[PDB]
Design a protein around this ligand. Structure first.
Ligand SMILES: C=C(C)[C@]12C[C@@H](C)[C@@]34O[C@](Cc5ccccc5)(O[C@@H]1[C@@H]3C=C(COC(=O)Cc1ccc(O)c(OC)c1)C[C@]1(O)C(=O)C(C)=C[C@@H]41)O2
Ligand SMILES: C=C(C)[C@]12C[C@@H](C)[C@@]34O[C@](Cc5ccccc5)(O[C@@H]1[C@@H]3C=C(COC(=O)Cc1ccc(O)c(OC)c1)C[C@]1(O)C(=O)C(C)=C[C@@H]41)O2
Lengths: 545, 80, 79, 67, 80
């Protein structure tokens, strides 16, 4: 017999499932592939060994485990065609690997956004779609989800393969019986002006993996998550949503937060000065206003506390994403914690509630900067502040604190039985040099005046003259390199705001779902018409008349 | 941005201070602004409880405005 | 010349050790000036903590830039 | 600072190299695991009939052109 | 500090019979786009006296490219 011989395959766990057809495809040998398929080789054989998985800690090459995906992933179009439409055994274009990935999922996987890789991966994606429609008009490959529930578009969005996404979202196919696979259509074109229509299926809303939701709620490890929202339909859609729906709601929330902080400010400012809270309410107008302000302040704290919980549960950040991103959410949550601890101490009859309350109050005002997103100038400014705090201020503060503590310990050792003679006071006196208030003769309680003055001059040169001016130089370097990155992060922050606004929505309004339900093709594989909620974009071009 | 930070920390500090000389938004705002021109006293009052909280607030203000924001302003004017 | 134009860190650690040893000698020679040496060791010791910022990508670059600033711009400016 | 970015990267790498060398020379435990990369047979055909084992270092690379 | 010649030598590969053994870079397997090179490491990691890493790292500061030579592929990957 031949059926057992031709289909023999490796049994070891490292190369498990690899057979002769895989080898022939790998070696780019068309004749051997043809011969093996002719002799009854199984075109569905899954090479699922450890070598054929992602497995970043070991060598390997994941391609989707199937001969069709192997041919596709290696830029062999002829073999793809042959495998799909040979006489003896056509391949199952919709087959799935152990991960649930199809050929198209694999093509997304191998993409890495380089020009030469991206060009052919996009081309192979296109050709596979054409052949799928011609072989199986009733099949919808792009709607098949892997074991993680991701469609190829969702996988491209989450993995950050900007090239493939940029191809898919404006894919247009100009021929009969493949028009319906298009996502970008041209409705009319009068002079140089022409009105394109983008599909917006699974961009605006879907079951789970809307493209906007996938990009915005990325795990911060996606490579190009800042750059992907520059892909044409997405940016124009976000701007439209902002202007039509969300600009007013965001401004309203900003106004409300302003009022809340004014109330909190007034309530804290006029606190009573007797000891031992809680304080008996007096039957007078001013005290009624005061207690009203206190109640509203605590209520707002509770609101932000529960909002922070809802954010944590919805995003489930994995204990690094909880901190390396979602800066603003953590800060708002910490404000709410300080408010709540203030309440608890207030009723537990401790004056230390004041210590918590002010930390809330100060923090509350600084979180006003959260609302500088949604302004092109100020949002960029606030983003740059955040990046400064995270990079340059942290590095500087480590080095500065090493120098400060070193010279502080030296000076306090040299000082003997004086007023300062302690790490705390000496640290304050040395820090005062940084703010331009160093006495430079703050004590005489020593021997060896020369040693003391040498130490202080060394400190002053190293921190005041060297380090601070170096910090200014470094921040100057930084802003020169984070202008455009700041623009992209601002756009991303506004996108997140838009998504959260649509999710909250507070009025059960369906006007959030924009762009109108238009007829694109009117000719699906069956006789029905397709309405696909297109988004209209008008363009003008002075070439290609 | 500076006025947001200034008013936030002024309101915090003036809340923490109790029945002292300053004890007002005007005097405290002036006293915190004095840090920007390199004249911050850093011990301008003792009329409080919780010295540690007061010092933490002032050092936070100083870092955020004097060290971070002014140097950032110089960087941005350089870019502009 | 190579003893000074490079091996910056090695010189600094050696000088810390010299200050410690002079501190010991003065301490047992019944001179109070040992304190003067000890603090110079102590201060210097803490600053030599920056030696270990190599082996961290973003911090080691920062420490190297400090060294280059000290050698070029701070020296010319101080003259 | 605008001119010593890349130079700083190279000097950082060199300083880490110095650290690595000094560490392997001190080593404090008489451990031979410091000598890495495994003794592989490269060619197996020297000018004589003997095989050559040359302690190679393995580096994997991917290229999407030149198929 | 002759970075050019060094960069040539360390990844020298000769594709013909009876000169394979002179190579220092070899290709073991290449499956798809993925391929596994082997660099010799004789006289680089360790040797009698003049290991390449020791020679570069302990340069006299007057070698022109002492910073740049460790960017050559096998050396940087080995150090990492
Ligand atoms: C990064 C963390 C979460 C942080 C949380 C609190 C404690 C915070 O202290 C810091 C540590 C610190 C302390 C003092 C100076 C700088 C940094 O910085 C921030 C954090 C530091 C900030 C920096 O200012 C901002 O971040 C405002 C802001 C900017 C951009 C935003 O997108 C934003 O979203 C809400 C908020 C302000 C403080 O909350 C503040 O006003 C007080 C009293 C302390 C600051 O910890
Ligand atoms: C360059 C020489 C060897 C030097 C040796 C001593 C005396 C030193 O004074 C200097 C002269 C000086 C004095 C005051 C301010 C700047 C410079 O600078 C360094 C040297 C200057 C330094 C500068 O800070 C550093 O070098 C820390 C450091 C950074 C990077 C490194 O790779 C490093 O390797 C250990 C150390 C700190 C001092 O040792 C210090 O803390 C005291 C008390 C004096 C500084 O002489």
């Amino acid at each position: 017999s031949l059926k057992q011989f031709v289909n023999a395959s490796y049994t070891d766990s490292y190369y498990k499932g690899q057979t002769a057809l895989h080898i022939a495809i790998e070696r780019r040998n068309m004749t051997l592939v043809t011969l093996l398929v002719e002799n009854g080789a199984d075109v569905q054989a899954a090479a699922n060994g450890d070598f054929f998985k992602k497995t970043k800690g070991r060598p390997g090459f994941y391609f989707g485990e199937l001969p069709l995906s192997l041919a596709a992933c290696t830029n062999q179009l002829a073999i793809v065609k042959f495998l799909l439409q040979n006489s003896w055994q056509p391949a199952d274009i919709s087959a799935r690997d152990s991960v649930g990935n199809t050929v198209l999922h694999a093509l997304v996987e191998v993409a890495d956004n380089t020009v030469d890789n991206t060009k052919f991966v996009t081309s192979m994606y296109n050709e596979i779609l054409i052949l799928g429609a011609k072989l199986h008009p009733t099949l919808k490959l792009e709607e098949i989800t892997n074991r993680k529930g991701l469609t190829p578009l969702a996988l491209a969005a989450s993995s950050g393969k900007i090239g493939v996404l940029a191809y898919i979202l404006q894919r247009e196919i100009h021929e009969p019986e493949c028009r319906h696979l298009s996502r970008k259509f041209t409705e009319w074109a009068y002079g140089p002006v022409h009105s394109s229509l983008y599909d917006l299926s699974c961009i605006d809303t879907c079951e789970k993996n809307s493209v906007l939701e996938v990009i915005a709620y990325s795990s911060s490890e996606t490579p190009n998550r800042h750059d992907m929202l520059l892909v044409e339909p997405l940016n124009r859609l976000l701007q439209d949503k902002w202007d039509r729906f969300v600009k007013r709601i965001f401004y309203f929330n900003f106004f409300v937060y302003c009022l809340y902080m004014i109330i909190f400010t007034a309530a804290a400012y006029y606190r009573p000065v007797e000891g031992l809270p809680p304080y008996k309410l007096k039957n007078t107008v001013g005290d009624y206003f005061r207690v009203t302000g206190e109640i509203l302040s605590v209520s707002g704290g509770v609101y932000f506390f529960f909002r922070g919980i809802q954010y944590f549960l919805q995003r489930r950040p994995s204990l690094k994403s909880l901190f390396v991103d979602s800066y603003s959410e953590i800060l708002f949550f910490v404000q709410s914690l300080f408010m709540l601890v203030s309440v608890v101490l207030y009723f537990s009859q401790r004056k230390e509630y004041v210590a918590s309350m002010v930390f809330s109050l100060a923090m509350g005002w600084t979180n006003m900067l959260y609302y500088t997103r949604g302004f092109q100038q100020m949002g960029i400014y606030a983003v740059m502040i955040e990046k400064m705090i995270l990079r340059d201020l942290c590095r500087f503060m480590f080095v500065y604190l090493v120098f400060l503590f070193g010279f502080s310990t030296a000076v306090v050792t040299l000082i003997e039985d004086g007023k300062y003679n302690s790490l705390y006071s000496t640290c304050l006196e040395l820090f005062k040099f940084t703010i331009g208030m160093g006495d430079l003769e703050f004590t005489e309680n020593y021997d060896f005046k020369a040693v003391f003055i040498i130490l202080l001059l060394a400190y002053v040169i190293l921190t005041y003259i060297l380090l601070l001016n170096m910090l200014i130089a470094l921040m100057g370097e930084t802003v020169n390199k984070i202008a455009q990155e700041s623009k992209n992060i601002w756009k991303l922050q506004r996108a997140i705001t838009i998504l959260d606004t649509e999710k909250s929505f507070l009025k059960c309004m369906r006007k959030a779902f924009r762009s109108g339900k238009l007829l694109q093709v009117g000719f699906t594989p069956d006789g029905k018409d397709d309405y696909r909620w297109c988004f209209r974009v008008d363009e003008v071009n002075w070439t290609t008349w």
